[PDB]
Design a protein around this motif. Structure first.
Motif, PDB file in Angstrom:
ATOM      1  N   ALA A 120       0.845  -1.162   0.000  1.00 32.17           N
ATOM      2  CA  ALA A 120       0.000   0.000   0.000  1.00 32.17           C
ATOM      3  C   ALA A 120       0.896   1.233   0.000  1.00 32.17           C
ATOM      4  O   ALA A 120       1.912   1.251   0.685  1.00 32.17           O
ATOM      5  CB  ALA A 120      -0.913   0.005   1.220  1.00 32.17           C
ATOM      6  N   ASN A 121       0.501   2.220  -0.787  1.00 35.62           N
ATOM      7  CA  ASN A 121       1.237   3.476  -0.944  1.00 35.62           C
ATOM      8  C   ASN A 121       0.438   4.497  -0.127  1.00 35.62           C
ATOM      9  O   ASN A 121      -0.610   4.978  -0.568  1.00 35.62           O
ATOM     10  CB  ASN A 121       1.280   3.866  -2.418  1.00 35.62           C
ATOM     11  N   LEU A 122       0.892   4.738   1.099  1.00 31.60           N
ATOM     12  CA  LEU A 122       0.118   5.513   2.056  1.00 31.60           C
ATOM     13  C   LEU A 122       0.609   6.963   2.229  1.00 31.60           C
ATOM     14  O   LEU A 122       1.812   7.239   2.099  1.00 31.60           O
ATOM     15  CB  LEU A 122       0.224   4.832   3.443  1.00 31.60           C
ATOM     16  N   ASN A 123      -0.292   7.833   2.674  1.00 29.98           N
ATOM     17  CA  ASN A 123       0.128   9.063   3.260  1.00 29.98           C
ATOM     18  C   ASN A 123       0.378   8.847   4.758  1.00 29.98           C
ATOM     19  O   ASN A 123       0.150   7.751   5.289  1.00 29.98           O
ATOM     20  CB  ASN A 123      -0.876  10.170   2.980  1.00 29.98           C
ATOM     21  N   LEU A 124       0.862   9.893   5.427  1.00 28.53           N
ATOM     22  CA  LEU A 124       1.193   9.760   6.843  1.00 28.53           C
ATOM     23  C   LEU A 124      -0.016   9.460   7.737  1.00 28.53           C
ATOM     24  O   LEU A 124       0.063   8.636   8.641  1.00 28.53           O
ATOM     25  CB  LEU A 124       1.914  10.985   7.339  1.00 28.53           C
ATOM     26  N   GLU A 125      -1.131  10.070   7.432  1.00 26.74           N
ATOM     27  CA  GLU A 125      -2.390   9.809   8.126  1.00 26.74           C
ATOM     28  C   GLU A 125      -2.811   8.294   8.066  1.00 26.74           C
ATOM     29  O   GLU A 125      -3.194   7.689   9.073  1.00 26.74           O
ATOM     30  CB  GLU A 125      -3.487  10.697   7.465  1.00 26.74           C
ATOM     31  N   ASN A 126      -2.741   7.698   6.887  1.00 31.15           N
ATOM     32  CA  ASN A 126      -3.112   6.310   6.728  1.00 31.15           C
ATOM     33  C   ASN A 126      -2.070   5.344   7.268  1.00 31.15           C
ATOM     34  O   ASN A 126      -2.423   4.300   7.778  1.00 31.15           O
ATOM     35  CB  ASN A 126      -3.469   6.031   5.297  1.00 31.15           C
ATOM     36  N   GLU A 127      -0.801   5.736   7.233  1.00 34.63           N
ATOM     37  CA  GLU A 127       0.241   4.973   7.884  1.00 34.63           C
ATOM     38  C   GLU A 127      -0.035   4.829   9.356  1.00 34.63           C
ATOM     39  O   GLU A 127       0.149   3.768   9.943  1.00 34.63           O
ATOM     40  CB  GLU A 127       1.595   5.641   7.682  1.00 34.63           C
ATOM     41  N   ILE A 128      -0.398   5.937   9.984  1.00 33.69           N
ATOM     42  CA  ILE A 128      -0.711   5.900  11.398  1.00 33.69           C
ATOM     43  C   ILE A 128      -1.987   5.086  11.697  1.00 33.69           C
ATOM     44  O   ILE A 128      -2.040   4.349  12.671  1.00 33.69           O
ATOM     45  CB  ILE A 128      -0.824   7.299  11.959  1.00 33.69           C
ATOM     46  N   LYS A 129      -2.979   5.227  10.865  1.00 28.37           N
ATOM     47  CA  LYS A 129      -4.202   4.485  11.001  1.00 28.37           C
ATOM     48  C   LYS A 129      -3.926   2.966  10.877  1.00 28.37           C
ATOM     49  O   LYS A 129      -4.372   2.172  11.700  1.00 28.37           O
ATOM     50  CB  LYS A 129      -5.181   4.906   9.926  1.00 28.37           C
ATOM     51  N   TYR A 130      -3.104   2.608   9.893  1.00 28.04           N
ATOM     52  CA  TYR A 130      -2.661   1.228   9.676  1.00 28.04           C
ATOM     53  C   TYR A 130      -1.882   0.663  10.857  1.00 28.04           C
ATOM     54  O   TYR A 130      -2.166  -0.435  11.319  1.00 28.04           O
ATOM     55  CB  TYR A 130      -1.830   1.120   8.390  1.00 28.04           C
ATOM     56  N   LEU A 131      -0.904   1.409  11.364  1.00 24.00           N
ATOM     57  CA  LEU A 131      -0.114   0.927  12.490  1.00 24.00           C
ATOM     58  C   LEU A 131      -0.913   0.818  13.775  1.00 24.00           C
ATOM     59  O   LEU A 131      -0.575   0.039  14.624  1.00 24.00           O
ATOM     60  CB  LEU A 131       1.099   1.807  12.725  1.00 24.00           C
ATOM     61  N   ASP A 132      -1.934   1.627  13.940  1.00 23.50           N
ATOM     62  CA  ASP A 132      -2.809   1.504  15.103  1.00 23.50           C
ATOM     63  C   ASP A 132      -3.747   0.297  14.924  1.00 23.50           C
ATOM     64  O   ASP A 132      -4.218  -0.215  15.880  1.00 23.50           O
ATOM     65  CB  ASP A 132      -3.657   2.753  15.288  1.00 23.50           C
ATOM     66  N   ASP A 133      -4.065  -0.079  13.687  1.00 26.52           N
ATOM     67  CA  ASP A 133      -4.968  -1.192  13.432  1.00 26.52           C
ATOM     68  C   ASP A 133      -4.714  -1.727  12.022  1.00 26.52           C
ATOM     69  O   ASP A 133      -5.157  -1.135  11.017  1.00 26.52           O
ATOM     70  CB  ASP A 133      -6.451  -0.744  13.607  1.00 26.52           C
ATOM     71  N   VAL A 134      -4.029  -2.863  11.953  1.00 27.44           N
ATOM     72  CA  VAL A 134      -3.509  -3.394  10.689  1.00 27.44           C
ATOM     73  C   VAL A 134      -4.619  -3.811   9.765  1.00 27.44           C
ATOM     74  O   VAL A 134      -4.400  -4.004   8.597  1.00 27.44           O
ATOM     75  CB  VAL A 134      -2.502  -4.560  10.845  1.00 27.44           C
ATOM     76  N   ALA A 135      -5.826  -3.935  10.271  1.00 31.54           N
ATOM     77  CA  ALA A 135      -6.987  -4.275   9.421  1.00 31.54           C
ATOM     78  C   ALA A 135      -7.838  -3.079   9.018  1.00 31.54           C
ATOM     79  O   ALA A 135      -8.923  -3.296   8.425  1.00 31.54           O
ATOM     80  CB  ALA A 135      -7.870  -5.303  10.151  1.00 31.54           C
ATOM     81  N   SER A 136      -7.366  -1.839   9.268  1.00 32.86           N
ATOM     82  CA  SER A 136      -8.202  -0.635   9.049  1.00 32.86           C
ATOM     83  C   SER A 136      -8.137   0.028   7.689  1.00 32.86           C
ATOM     84  O   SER A 136      -8.922   0.911   7.441  1.00 32.86           O
ATOM     85  CB  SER A 136      -7.897   0.398  10.118  1.00 32.86           C
ATOM     86  N   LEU A 137      -7.235  -0.381   6.768  1.00 34.25           N
ATOM     87  CA  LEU A 137      -7.178   0.284   5.474  1.00 34.25           C
ATOM     88  C   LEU A 137      -8.325  -0.102   4.573  1.00 34.25           C
ATOM     89  O   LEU A 137      -8.773  -1.234   4.609  1.00 34.25           O
ATOM     90  CB  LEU A 137      -5.899  -0.015   4.723  1.00 34.25           C
ATOM     91  N   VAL A 138      -8.788   0.857   3.775  1.00 32.96           N
ATOM     92  CA  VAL A 138      -9.816   0.650   2.742  1.00 32.96           C
ATOM     93  C   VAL A 138      -9.136   0.947   1.429  1.00 32.96           C
ATOM     94  O   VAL A 138      -8.010   1.470   1.396  1.00 32.96           O
ATOM     95  CB  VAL A 138     -11.079   1.544   2.911  1.00 32.96           C
ATOM     96  N   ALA A 139      -9.760   0.513   0.366  1.00 41.34           N
ATOM     97  CA  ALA A 139      -9.126   0.451  -0.938  1.00 41.34           C
ATOM     98  C   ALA A 139      -8.497   1.786  -1.359  1.00 41.34           C
ATOM     99  O   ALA A 139      -7.368   1.826  -1.848  1.00 41.34           O
ATOM    100  CB  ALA A 139     -10.152  -0.007  -1.988  1.00 41.34           C
ATOM    101  N   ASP A 140      -9.216   2.869  -1.132  1.00 45.08           N
ATOM    102  CA  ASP A 140      -8.678   4.179  -1.523  1.00 45.08           C
ATOM    103  C   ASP A 140      -7.391   4.526  -0.805  1.00 45.08           C
ATOM    104  O   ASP A 140      -6.579   5.169  -1.367  1.00 45.08           O
ATOM    105  CB  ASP A 140      -9.713   5.296  -1.334  1.00 45.08           C
ATOM    106  N   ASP A 141      -7.192   4.037   0.408  1.00 46.89           N
ATOM    107  CA  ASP A 141      -5.958   4.314   1.145  1.00 46.89           C
ATOM    108  C   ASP A 141      -4.722   3.759   0.477  1.00 46.89           C
ATOM    109  O   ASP A 141      -3.619   4.223   0.729  1.00 46.89           O
ATOM    110  CB  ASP A 141      -6.031   3.726   2.538  1.00 46.89           C
ATOM    111  N   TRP A 142      -4.918   2.772  -0.387  1.00 49.15           N
ATOM    112  CA  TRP A 142      -3.800   2.076  -0.949  1.00 49.15           C
ATOM    113  C   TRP A 142      -3.004   2.903  -1.964  1.00 49.15           C
ATOM    114  O   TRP A 142      -1.849   2.546  -2.305  1.00 49.15           O
ATOM    115  CB  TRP A 142      -4.268   0.763  -1.608  1.00 49.15           C
TER     116      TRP A 142
END
Lengths: 168, 170
Positions: free
Chosen positions: B60-82
């Motif tokens: 996944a090619n993340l911004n900093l906001e989604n990186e943090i969201k991902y690291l807080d919960d590895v199952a939290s990304l949605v398709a657009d975050d990628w």
């Protein structure tokens, strides 16, 4: 075999769209689905190129029926063609298409009989349900079921006599 | 057929998870979460041998906001975050038949100028170990500068997020 993976992917997607099955582990998908696909003992219904319903069945001998009922995840692929006692291993239609699956089975397996087990984890009780094809005579079906049941109960009771507790 | 290809790939990956000691215990929900957006965005590699899959990784090619969201919960990304930024994360890496080096080499040589991180949650430690990977044409000194900046940016924003969690009413 490319076909195989494609079907497996569809079934996985359908499990993932189902409230209970989505929580089940990938191990159980391999156990329940690979032999279904390999033996072609399944029906997958689709709409607009997306799966909407799936059922599969294992043709067991009495030994494997008891094994399965002691542990629903214990069957191996060879068990799926081991006898003539048919069990629905999965039956899902998470978007409301169960009637279409039912009808498909009724019409395409018109003289077959199948059982399914459902387990209530809050009472630890399993219930067995019975299904039969659309053309087979009601009286004959009911007699075959009674015989299956008597054979199962008697063998369970016999095995009950040898059961014991393990202690150091 | 674009999506029969899709289901095919999803089946191959599912088979691979089922062959893996840890992944086989994960739920089907996580398979859909991790794998459907990889397939959609084409941000994956699937290695095969004799027409059978042997290994798979996704990113996944993340911004900093989604990186943090991902690291807080590895199952939290949605398709657009990628496709949401330029901080690349390996979402899955699986090679249950021993072909991990092969994945590594493939990524090193085919993404020679890319950087990726991955998180592994110890587990006997309650610490995630972040690993750092870079393609074969990024030298060490450069990789280490970019990674140090990524890390400092992550740590700073994790700290700053604490300020927005609570208010006092008295």
């Amino acid at each position: 075999k490319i076909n195989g993976f494609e079907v497996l992917g569809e079934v996985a997607w359908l499990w993932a769209s189902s409230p209970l099955h989505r929580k089940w582990p990938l191990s159980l998908l391999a156990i329940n689905v690979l032999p279904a696909i390999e033996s072609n003992q399944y029906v997958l219904l689709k709409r607009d190129g997306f799966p909407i319903a799936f059922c599969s069945w294992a043709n067991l001998n009495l030994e494997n029926e008891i094994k399965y009922l002691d542990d629903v995840a214990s069957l191996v692929a060879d068990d799926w063609t081991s006898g003539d006692r048919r069990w629905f291993i999965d039956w899902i239609a998470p978007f409301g298409d169960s009637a279409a699956l039912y009808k498909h089975m009724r019409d395409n397996f018109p003289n077959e009989l199948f059982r399914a087990i459902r387990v209530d984890p809050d009472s630890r009780v399993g219930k067995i349900s019975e299904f039969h094809g659309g053309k087979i005579d009601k009286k004959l079906a009911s007699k075959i079921f009674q015989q299956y049941h008597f054979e199962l109960m008697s063998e369970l009771k016999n095995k009950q006599n040898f059961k014991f507790s393990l202690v150091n």
